[PDB]
Symmetry: C2
Subunit: 309 residues, 2 copies
């Protein structure tokens, strides 16, 4: 490995770990990519870095400009650590219904937070971010529209999976938030390596928007955005699979308990999908790869841990 000139350069190179007890009695192989092991501990670190780097290259972002994005979750954390490592002023807009601890993490990187009325929800944070981003000197990455999001997974996540498995990956299963992960990995495998792979998107059964149903409330943070994102390319996805909130929560708990993998709720969702796919007779002896986006300690205040006080 090189010496990274700042922490944003250290994204990726995450490990593939074989799942052993949740797969007991299957003849396929299930490998988990641990995206929790990133400079700011989630998969979003890849796109926080890539969207900043790409805006530098194109001139949309210049030194002294202000970065603004409407986000509570992992994307705010990634942008915060990247802007701190690379020296940009950062503002994040979020409804005031935001956990005091997620805000501490964001403020530890020196991000400025703009709370918008909780009643207007996410669309209120988006409106404020658009208003701020309209002024000159401010840049908005736009995580759901920015092609630099799937492109970094074409350049890093995709190749890492291809090379760590030595070309043995027959199924890729990924929860879909912005959809950049599943789009970039599928593009790399199918178009750049010409590799046959069955690509499965995972969404909450309570908000099955990718399969055409109506958005709803759900607890699988980071996926189920309530719309089909522009960064999600349905043409490289072969199947949509939904999981319940309880399946996701329980499978994340079993990943820690039975595999020693501390991970979040959407990790349980992805794995719960992957293990159902991996039980199909047509995939006997095949390799199923899935992504676990972040780590369990980010979920101490959530429903993931409520059974442990």
């Amino acid at each position: 490995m090189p010496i990274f000139k700042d922490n944003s350069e250290s994204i990726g190179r995450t490990p593939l770990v074989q799942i052993n007890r949740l797969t007991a009695g299957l003849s396929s192989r299930v490998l988990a990519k641990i995206e929790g092991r990133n400079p700011a501990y989630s998969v979003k670190c890849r796109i926080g870095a890539a969207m900043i780097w790409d805006a530098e290259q194109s001139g949309k972002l210049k030194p002294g400009m202000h970065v603004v994005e409407p986000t509570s979750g992992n994307t705010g954390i990634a942008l915060a650590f990247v802007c701190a490592a690379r020296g940009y002023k950062l503002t994040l807009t979020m409804p005031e219904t935001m956990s005091i601890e997620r805000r501490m993490m964001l403020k530890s990187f020196g991000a400025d937070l703009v709370l918008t009325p909780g009643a207007d929800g996410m669309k209120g944070a988006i409106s404020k971010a658009e208003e701020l981003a309209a002024q000159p000197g401010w840049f908005i990455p736009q995580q759901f529209k920015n092609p630099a999001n799937p492109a970094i997974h074409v350049k890093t996540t995709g190749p890492e999976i291809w090379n760590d498995t030595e070309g043995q990956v027959d199924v890729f299963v990924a929860g879909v938030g912005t959809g950049g992960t599943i789009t970039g990995v599928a593009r790399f495998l199918k178009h750049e390596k010409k590799h046959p792979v069955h690509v499965v998107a995972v969404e909450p059964a309570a908000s099955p928007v990718l399969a055409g149903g109506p958005a709803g409330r759900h607890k699988i943070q980071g996926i189920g955005a309530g719309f089909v994102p522009d960064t999600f390319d349905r043409s490289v996805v072969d199947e949509i699979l939904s999981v319940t909130d309880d399946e996701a929560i329980e499978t994340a708990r079993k990943l820690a308990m039975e595999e020693g993998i501390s991970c979040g709720i959407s990790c349980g969702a992805a794995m719960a999908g992957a293990l159902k796919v991996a039980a199909r007779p047509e995939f006997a002896g095949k390799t199923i790869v899935t992504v676990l986006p972040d780590a369990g300690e980010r979920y101490l205040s959530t429903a993931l841990f409520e059974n442990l006080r």
Copy 2:
């Protein structure tokens, strides 16, 4: 990277990141090794894996046996994920001062917790664990005595530093808890690569036991054990340096804020010492390497985040 057959094999291979703003105006070069990027997110993952593997190879640990260890933080977490990954019953002793968040992390891996009197500290934990380990069928790794602890650093941490710097490491600065990190890296560089390295042990000014002062209470968790561990090899250490709780907490805040590196209190302690050493005239144009043991989210409930409510 290979496919890891379980999560314990995925230890290490952590990045070296150049520190840029905290070093502004020094002519030396300070590189931070990010041990938060480990399967259970601390440096102890290396020795949790290694001590279990070593006990398996030696026959001191067999399938069906019960693992027991005293811990005040990361060693419990490391052993917990390893025992979940590899299938051992685990019981940890710890003072009742252990935060609720730490307990929950240990419970998520299915470890049993035995609480010892808070005012008796680590020594009261060590004694209850020794008691429990007397039972036939029980095994105690003994993190302060087990040579498998510095050995894994001779085998992984040392070589990673040597390889990523291409033999450019003139100073090694590390906080001492068990001392295995500094002992193993220093043995590797001095005894095996025959490389001249100024090796700096960092301990709390409020508990300068390595320097022969009295044990005292302090907030730099993970270091300042209150005694000199057998796994600390004084013959490979060139200098003992004290840092205040205030220095450590503030420097950990500055690493997040000015570098985008979210890390723990002991990380600020090591960096506070590394920056002092790196400003010395004899190290102009030289390379100083230090270890940042874990990640910031483990410390939300601590004095590290007191300034953010």
